[PDB]
Amino acid sequence: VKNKCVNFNFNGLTGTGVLTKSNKKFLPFQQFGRDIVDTTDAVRDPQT
Amino acid sequence: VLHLTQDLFLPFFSNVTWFHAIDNPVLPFNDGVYFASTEKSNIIRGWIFGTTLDSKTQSLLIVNNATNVFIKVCEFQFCNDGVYSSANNCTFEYVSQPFLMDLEGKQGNFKNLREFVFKNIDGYFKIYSKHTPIIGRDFPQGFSALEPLVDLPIGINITRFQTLLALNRADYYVGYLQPRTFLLKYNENGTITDAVDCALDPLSETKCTLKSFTVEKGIYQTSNFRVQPTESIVRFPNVTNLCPFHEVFNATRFASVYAWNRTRISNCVADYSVLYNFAPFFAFKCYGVSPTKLNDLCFTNVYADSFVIKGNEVSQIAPGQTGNIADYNYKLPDDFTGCVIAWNSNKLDSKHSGNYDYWYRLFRKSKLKPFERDISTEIYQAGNKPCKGKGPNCYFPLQSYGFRPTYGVGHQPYRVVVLSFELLHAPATVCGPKKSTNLVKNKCVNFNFNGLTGTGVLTKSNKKFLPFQQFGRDIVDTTDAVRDPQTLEILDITPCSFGGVSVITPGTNTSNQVAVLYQGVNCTEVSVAIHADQLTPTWRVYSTGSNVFQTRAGCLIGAEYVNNSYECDIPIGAGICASYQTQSQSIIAYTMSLGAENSVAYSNNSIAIPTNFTISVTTEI
Amino acid sequence: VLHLTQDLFLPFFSNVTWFHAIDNPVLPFNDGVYFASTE
Amino acid sequence: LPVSMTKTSVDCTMYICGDSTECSNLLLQYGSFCTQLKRALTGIAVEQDKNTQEVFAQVKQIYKTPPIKYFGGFNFSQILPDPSKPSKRSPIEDLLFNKVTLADAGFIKQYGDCLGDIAARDLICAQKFNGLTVLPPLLTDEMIAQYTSALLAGTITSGWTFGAGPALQIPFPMQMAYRFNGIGVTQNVLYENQKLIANQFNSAIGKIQDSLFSTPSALGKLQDVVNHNAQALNTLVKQLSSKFGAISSVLNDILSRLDPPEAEVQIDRLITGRLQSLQTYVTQQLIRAAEIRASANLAATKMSECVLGQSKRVDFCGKGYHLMSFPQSAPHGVVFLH
Amino acid sequence: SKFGAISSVLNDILSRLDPPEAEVQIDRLITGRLQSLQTYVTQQLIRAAEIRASANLAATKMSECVLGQSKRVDFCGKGYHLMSFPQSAPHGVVFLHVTYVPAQEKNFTTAPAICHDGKAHFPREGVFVSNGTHWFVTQRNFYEPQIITTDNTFVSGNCDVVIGIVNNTVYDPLQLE
Amino acid sequence: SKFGAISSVLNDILSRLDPPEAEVQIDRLITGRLQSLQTYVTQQLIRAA
Amino acid sequence: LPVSMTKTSVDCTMYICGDSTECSNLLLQYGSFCTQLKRALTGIAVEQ
Ligand SMILES: *[C@@H]1O[C@H](CO)[C@@H](O[C@@H]2O[C@H](CO)[C@@H](O)[C@H](O)[C@@H]2O)[C@H](O)[C@H]1NC(C)=O
Ligand SMILES: *[C@@H]1O[C@H](CO)[C@@H](O[C@@H]2O[C@H](CO)[C@@H](O)[C@H](O)[C@@H]2O)[C@H](O)[C@H]1NC(C)=O
Ligand SMILES: *[C@@H]1O[C@H](CO)[C@@H](O[C@@H]2O[C@H](CO)[C@@H](O)[C@H](O)[C@@H]2O)[C@H](O)[C@H]1NC(C)=O
Ligand SMILES: *[C@@H]1O[C@H](CO)[C@@H](O[C@@H]2O[C@H](CO)[C@@H](O)[C@H](O)[C@@H]2O)[C@H](O)[C@H]1NC(C)=O
Ligand SMILES: *[C@@H]1O[C@H](CO)[C@@H](O[C@@H]2O[C@H](CO)[C@@H](O)[C@H](O)[C@@H]2O)[C@H](O)[C@H]1NC(C)=O
Ligand SMILES: *[C@@H]1O[C@H](CO)[C@@H](O)[C@H](O)[C@H]1NC(C)=O
Ligand SMILES: *[C@@H]1O[C@H](CO)[C@@H](O)[C@H](O)[C@H]1NC(C)=O
Ligand SMILES: *[C@@H]1O[C@H](CO)[C@@H](O)[C@H](O)[C@H]1NC(C)=O
Ligand SMILES: *[C@@H]1O[C@H](CO)[C@@H](O)[C@H](O)[C@H]1NC(C)=O
Ligand SMILES: *[C@@H]1O[C@H](CO)[C@@H](O)[C@H](O)[C@H]1NC(C)=O
Ligand SMILES: *[C@@H]1O[C@H](CO)[C@@H](O)[C@H](O)[C@H]1NC(C)=O
Ligand SMILES: *[C@@H]1O[C@H](CO)[C@@H](O)[C@H](O)[C@H]1NC(C)=O
Ligand SMILES: *[C@@H]1O[C@H](CO)[C@@H](O)[C@H](O)[C@H]1NC(C)=O
Ligand SMILES: *[C@@H]1O[C@H](CO)[C@@H](O)[C@H](O)[C@H]1NC(C)=O
Ligand SMILES: *[C@@H]1O[C@H](CO)[C@@H](O)[C@H](O)[C@H]1NC(C)=O
Ligand SMILES: *[C@@H]1O[C@H](CO)[C@@H](O)[C@H](O)[C@H]1NC(C)=O
């Protein structure tokens, strides 16, 4: 359920917000995402 | 982003030990190991870990082959060359893709550089690998990020490390990680392009404080420098008398709770191993002090109140407790700083046909205030009768702790001795067994004077210590002078070269050279400290003799004093400014030039009046 | 230094009862007593 | 008018956790909460330096008095520098330095004599024992007197022209006449009572020096600022003897008495107390530095108006119709002679 | 920052622990974050008070330098101020002071007054200046020599009290006509 | 404001708990009120400036 | 134009510990954290 306010519990990372497609360049080992202030920014879909 | 992290890293310009292979020494493992190797196709298979590498401690094997790996946690015996001969307690196998990638452009020019980093934080063994087609240099210098490959929960005490070889008919580069602070420059793609260690050089360390890769022109306060004690002196009482703890525990008639036998422990050395020995311990709840580190403390007076009491009243005894015993028989003070001890004694307080020797009070007119004995035989009043006797409405105060060799756990004759300490500022008479070292003056040194731990410079003094005086202080209430227990002399106490390091540098887009300041400390002390390698900063700035300048604002290292006068470029303090000026370029320090020296032609009848004018448009923001 | 302390101290300009001798009354003890004698 | 305060660079790690690795590790759990403190103190130091620059460095050219000193009968030898004195400071200036006592000079490098203190170590050694140092001001008290002398020689030999552009020499009686013309009195009146006004000027110079001497404290503002800073530092250091509701008030014996996973609570209690006290100190220093910045901006405006010219605003440059103002350097401040 | 708690994430601690202790960690996070926020607000108050002082300075500068000529030296830029022009900047203002700055000057001579006939003449406005041979009257900030006249000077004195006086002749446009 | 203690009345919590633990709630109230007073004094100093 | 504010002289001992001896004892363990406050308010009143 993208582009909609949703409660997410991604692989144990719980939070609130809106999700959508992205054009990141995650390396294969990368799993989470963050910012300079270490705020969880991107989550790789574990089943997609 | 320029994210900064604190984690085990290989220090920049650290030392990797380069070996050869033509027997395979065991390398110590501590805080992780960096590994690298350049081989034509394959001469290294894997690594083995563990402790003592025998069939007594769990070990590891990271051997590889052409198609997979062979990760396992086992207790192999030995091979002395099929790389093991035991699989008894060997579970937790693991198989996945191989760790070694080798590619050639139709030529063996590629030594397939293989960088590996392993570590064992809270178990969870982590392996990071990155293969770079070999260039001209074996261990060159260009940056290469390291990516994780696997992380699985090992949970064994990795201390030793070894490698495996291959068969046939300049590699192995190994480094050690220690905990440092690193700043990493993250590429737009998410990769790592540049990293800087915050323990390498002044410019690097500042770079790691102005969190960026460009340190612009100016002077930046970064950290502090502190001399490190070359030695560690402890001075403890001249006597080495073992305390009579043995006699306190080797007693045969530990008095009952209603009359708590209180012994005194003074002028002795308390070694609590003898306390452990005479103790099938069941309850060693220490409150004011950690029981483990009991031999490193100096106490003024030690109290050993001993009484035998039931099982549940062992749980009863504690500060701020309650019960028939805790209220009318033995109340510990709330602010208790000490240990209570209970070990079962059914062999000395029991016999056939019974034993009713022991006593306890359930009847007291009021609560027992902390550390008070109320030995007295008065019948408790009930109602309003002045009755003096036993029976109904006239109750005898204390009843019996009747003991026979057969009860349940909560009702056996537990033996209880409590230790009460006085851990305050006083001349202690009881200390732990320690070796009183010698005295070294005029040298930063950790001191443990009669249990007063600290660090600083000691020396002779002309104080007028009165005979009872033991300590020193100031209006700020900090220990200043401590009298020597074994020489009866006055020794002052000082900070161990505390200051502040500021680095003067021009913009990194201009030059990489730097000038370092140690604030409010003569360079003679930092020069000897640097030559003694006892300075807290690890970055050692070069000292060519021409780069030392004792300023009024501290002392400068790395900049030469130029007697000329220029406009201030970088303010250091006390009228001294440093700047990057041509020689062909270097960093110089100079005194302020407040402006051009000018003289007016004032006279009795001489006047200056402009014959012209200009219109100037300035700006203000 | 001008250190300030809080302890059991004889109050300034307080009552001090002066005795003589020529029988040895028992005196109450509370929060300590200050004793002085010239002989 | 105060111009600056003592610059401080209190350090978190040493002030709160004296060389204790576990204490520093548990302090790292509060984040950069105190990197803000170091940044604020650095900003205060830089602001004080800029305040001194704004107040005093108002001339780009350092002027010098003529070798002869005959200003139409006016006696000024009390405010120009004295060559014989090594510090090259005016007699008016010397009283100012002798009537203000600094608790911490800062430019002492006092390390090395805390061992030689013999007696109980003083406030400075105590502060060094717990990581609170004093940085020295960028402009020393000597070249600040050079700036003051440059300003003084600019006024008495060039009038107010040097405050605008090139310094144009003009006889002192003539500058007096022009300032008089600036307050609505004909320049002629001066040229018939030059002797009387010179005698009155000399008498007032002499009496004001005596007034600033026999007085108990006419420098109350500067001494108040110095006392405030010293008292703030003393209150800062004194909180290190406060248990803050823990077993003891010393990190070294707390770690040496309790094992790590029970001493953690006590060490965290100390961290909470000490960080709160340090935040109190830093906020109060920020407030006082803002106050001193306002005072120093007032001083800079007063210099630029009363010194580099005649100010028509009544009761700004002292009481009465303003004529001139001679600045004098003071410990952490400036003193005007309107 | 964990501030001394198990974790720094509220949705983590809540969904991992049960109130009893937990609350304890959430209270720790409260006493950390609230104190941090109070630090932020206090610093903002300090900075906003300083900016208010700077803004009052700017407003007075505008009202004086722009809406008029300011006689206070050095206030509206360096030199004899003439006018200013304000310009808008992000979160601030930029002033363009236009100041009159003098230029090339020459030693000439000067005397406080000129005694024509037993009476001392003083300049109505300007400076008594001498080329070196012929005395002249001029301005203060610009050289513009003018012939000494009874209108360019006012007379009051006795030629015997003013020191530095010089002998010269002042002209009158009345005797000729 | 209870500040995370049993109650906000000091006279109540002294008579309802014994020192050992009471001390904890009293310390909580202490650090709450003292921090509130610190905020008040800082804001008053700002207002006075 | 404002010229002065109300002069306040709060006292820590009562404000934090209403006539409670054990609370005074507990507050004493916080050092001279309240002498500073009384000094600050007194200085503010004098400044007004
Ligand atoms: C508690 O019981 C202890 C053991 O008897 C007493 O300690 C010792 O008693 C022996 C008796 O011969 C002494 O020789 C020895 O010096 C030591 O005192 C202790 O006194 C006693 N205390 C009380 C308060 O009863
Ligand atoms: C006053 O100063 C002016 C500039 O500061 C002079 O103007 C100059 O005139 C010359 C030609 O004479 C130009 O080449 C130059 O660009 C400038 O415009 C002006 O002459 C001068 N006047 C006097 C009397 O000195
Ligand atoms: C200017 O004012 C000076 C004040 O210090 C005068 O110096 C004086 O010198 C006399 C000795 O001649 C001392 O007795 C006196 O204490 C003072 O120092 C100085 O003479 C004076 N000069 C002129 C020209 O007025
Ligand atoms: C004094 O001021 C005089 C101005 O009137 C200057 O005299 C001039 O001299 C020329 C001839 O050289 C005359 O033709 C002219 O009318 C004027 O009088 C004179 O240069 C000046 N003196 C000096 C020393 O500059
Ligand atoms: C200006 O001119 C006056 C006459 O025009 C001079 O007065 C003379 O003074 C001398 C003595 O100096 C007398 O002897 C004579 O009778 C006449 O009064 C005056 O001195 C002169 N001043 C200057 C400075 O030249
Ligand atoms: C997840 O597993 C299902 C079941 O086999 C499979 O159909 C799907 O492709 C898998 N997706 C991923 C991303 O592993
Ligand atoms: C590597 O070892 C595994 C485990 O025995 C085996 O399955 C695999 O075939 C081996 N690959 C080779 C021999 O190339
Ligand atoms: C194997 O070793 C582990 C690690 O000590 C141990 O926990 C386990 O009991 C052992 N298995 C046996 C003894 O069967
Ligand atoms: C060895 O590792 C195990 C894994 O939990 C741990 O229990 C043990 O404490 C470690 N050894 C030591 C000496 O700490
Ligand atoms: C009493 O002393 C004997 C003598 O060796 C010893 O064996 C025994 O353990 C001691 N008992 C206690 C309780 O200390
Ligand atoms: C300490 O003991 C030794 C040996 O008994 C003695 O020589 C020395 O004088 C003693 N020192 C003091 C201070 O008692
Ligand atoms: C600092 O300056 C020099 C150089 O070290 C030397 O006299 C001594 O170490 C210090 N001087 C004083 C006065 O402390
Ligand atoms: C040049 O510098 C030296 C010290 O580096 C100094 O002793 C000397 O006086 C200086 N010369 C001049 C002319 O200032
Ligand atoms: C100015 O006049 C005084 C007194 O006549 C004299 O001492 C001084 O030398 C004169 N100076 C000049 C430059 O003429
Ligand atoms: C001391 O005792 C006398 C006699 O009872 C009494 O008069 C006096 O007031 C007492 N001292 C004080 C300070 O009250
Ligand atoms: C006036 O003459 C003096 C003496 O030579 C000289 O120093 C000064 O520069 C001159 N001023 C001028 C020419 O404007």
DSSP B278-338: T--EEE--BSSS-STT-TT-EES-EEEEEEEE-SHHHHH-STT--SHHHHHT----TT--E
d(CA B233, CA B453): 10
Q: Contact at 8 Å (CB) between B429 and B228? A: no
Distance of CA B363 to the CA centre of its chain: 52
Ramachandran category for residue B389: left, alpha or beta (phi over 0 → left; psi -120 to 50 → alpha):
left
Tell me whether strands B452-457 and B171-176 are parallel, antiparallel or unpaired.
unpaired
Distance of CA D75 to the CA centre of its chain: 29
Chain A residues closer than 8 Å to E15 by CB: 14
d(CA B481, CA B471): 6
Q: Contact at 8 Å (CB) between B202 and B514? A: yes
Chain B residues closer than 8 Å to E101 by CB: 613-616
d(CA B120, CA B123): 5
Cα of B271 vs centre of ligand 10, distance in Å, is 16
Q: Is E110–B606 a contact, with Cβ atoms under 8 angstroms apart? A: yes
The number of residues making up chain F comes to 49
Structural tokens at position G29: 């363990």
Chain F residues with a Cβ under 8 Å from any Cβ in chain B: 18-21
Q: Tell me which H or E stretch contains E135.
A: strand E135-137
- Check pocket membership of B91 for ligand 8, CB cut-off 6 A: no
In chain A, count H helices and then E strands: 0, 2
Question: Which chains pack against B, by 3+ Cβ pairs within 8 A?
Answer: A, C, D, E, F
Q: Is G30–F34 a contact, with Cβ atoms under 8 angstroms apart? A: yes
Give strand pairing partners of B69.
B64
- Nearest-CA residue for atom 9 of ligand 7: B67
Give strand pairing partners of B565.
B591
- Nearest-CA residue for atom 1 of ligand 14: B604
Q: Tell me which H or E stretch contains B232.
A: strand B231-233
Q: Is E49–F43 a contact, with Cβ atoms under 8 angstroms apart? A: no
Question: Which ligand approaches the C-alpha of residue A46 most closely?
Answer: 6
3 state DSSP class of D200: helix
Other beta carbons less than 10 A from residue D320's beta carbon: 10
- Nearest-CA residue for atom 6 of ligand 8: B89
Q: Which residues contact E43 (CB under 8 A, 6 or more apart)?
A: D36, D40, D286
Q: Contact at 8 Å (CB) between B69 and B46? A: yes
Does chain D touch chain A (at least 3 C-beta pairs within 8 Å)? Answer: no
Which of E45, E46, E51, E52 is the best mutation test for F, with the most CBs of F within 10 A?
Answer: E45
- Check pocket membership of B612 for ligand 2, CB cut-off 6 A: yes
Chain D residues closer than 8 Å to F45 by CB: 284, 287
Question: Measured in Å, how far apart are chain E's first and last C-alpha atoms?
Answer: 97
- Check pocket membership of C38 for ligand 15, CB cut-off 6 A: no
Q: Is D287–F27 a contact, with Cβ atoms under 8 angstroms apart? A: no
Q: Contact at 8 Å (CB) between B327 and B317? A: no
Distance of CA B354 to the CA centre of its chain: 56
Atom of ligand 4 nearest to the CA of E132: 24
- CA F34 to chain G, closest CA, distance in angstroms equals 7
3 state DSSP class of D129: helix
Atom of ligand 15 nearest to the CA of C14: 13
- Check pocket membership of B251 for ligand 1, CB cut-off 6 A: yes
- Check pocket membership of B601 for ligand 16, CB cut-off 6 A: yes
Does chain F touch chain A (at least 3 C-beta pairs within 8 Å)? Answer: no
- Nearest-CA residue for atom 4 of ligand 9: B155
CA angle A17, A19, A20 (to 5 degrees): 155
**In 3D, which of D230, D243, D310, D279 has the Cα closest to residue D30?**
D279
- Check pocket membership of B157 for ligand 9, CB cut-off 6 A: yes
- Nearest-CA residue for atom 10 of ligand 10: B250
D91-120 as b/e: b if 16+ CB within 10 A: ebbebbbebbeebbebbebbbeebbebbeb
Q: Contact at 8 Å (CB) between B376 and B420? A: no
Distance of CA E175 to the CA centre of its chain: 49
CA-atom Rg of chain B in angstroms: 37
Does chain C touch chain B (at least 3 C-beta pairs within 8 Å)? Answer: yes
Backbone angles phi, psi at B241, to 5 degrees: -85, 125
Chain D residues closer than 8 Å to F38 by CB: 276, 280
- Check pocket membership of D112 for ligand 12, CB cut-off 6 A: yes
Give strand pairing partners of B599.
none
Structural tokens at position B74: 């086992």
The type of residue at D335 is: V
**DSSP per residue, B89-146:** T-EEEE--S-S-----SSSTT---EEEEEEE-TTS-EEEEEEEE---SSSS--S----
Method used for this model? cryo-EM
Q: Is F19–B319 a contact, with Cβ atoms under 8 angstroms apart? A: no
Q: Is G29–D277 a contact, with Cβ atoms under 8 angstroms apart? A: no
- CA B466 to chain C, closest CA, distance in angstroms equals 16
Kindly provide the resolution of this structure in angstroms, with one decimal: 3.8
Give strand pairing partners of D151.
none
Q: Is B334–F21 a contact, with Cβ atoms under 8 angstroms apart? A: no
The type of residue at B455 is: T
**In 3D, which of D71, B613, D192 has the Cα closest to residue E139?**
B613
Q: Is A15–E11 a contact, with Cβ atoms under 8 angstroms apart? A: yes
d(CA E80, CA D108): 44
D238 interfaces chain G, CB cutoff of 8 Å:
yes
A45 interfaces chain B, CB cutoff of 8 Å:
no
A3 interfaces chain E, CB cutoff of 8 Å:
no
Q: What is the DSSP letter of F46?
A: H
Q: Contact at 8 Å (CB) between B494 and D114? A: yes
Which of F16, F35, F37, F47 is the best mutation test for G, with the most CBs of G within 10 A?
Answer: F37
Backbone angles phi, psi at D93, to 5 degrees: -65, -40
- List all residues of chain D from 141 to 160 with a beta carbon under 8 Å from chain E: 160
d(CA D42, CA D135): 10
- List all residues of chain B from 430 to 489 with a beta carbon under 8 Å from chain C: 473-475
Backbone angles phi, psi at B100, to 5 degrees: -105, 120
Does chain F touch chain C (at least 3 C-beta pairs within 8 Å)? Answer: no
Structural tokens at position D250: 């010393």
Question: Which ligand approaches the C-alpha of residue C12 most closely?
Answer: 15
The type of residue at B77 is: Q
Choose the closest CB to D283 out of E1, E42, E49.
E42
Q: Contact at 8 Å (CB) between B356 and B288? A: no
Which of F42, F44, F45, F47 is the best mutation test for E, with the most CBs of E within 10 A?
Answer: F42
- Check pocket membership of A47 for ligand 6, CB cut-off 6 A: yes
Burial of E109 (0-12, 13-18, 19+ CB in 10 A): middle
Burial of B442 (0-12, 13-18, 19+ CB in 10 A): exposed
- Check pocket membership of B614 for ligand 2, CB cut-off 6 A: yes
Cα of B382 vs centre of ligand 11, distance in Å, is 63
Question: Which ligand approaches the C-alpha of residue B68 most closely?
Answer: 7
Q: Contact at 8 Å (CB) between D110 and B520? A: yes
Q: Is C2–B474 a contact, with Cβ atoms under 8 angstroms apart? A: no
SS (H, E, C) B354-403: CECCCEEECCCCCCCCCCCCCCCCCCEECCCCCCCCCECCEECCEEECCE
Torsion sign (Cα): B138, B144, B150, B153 = positive
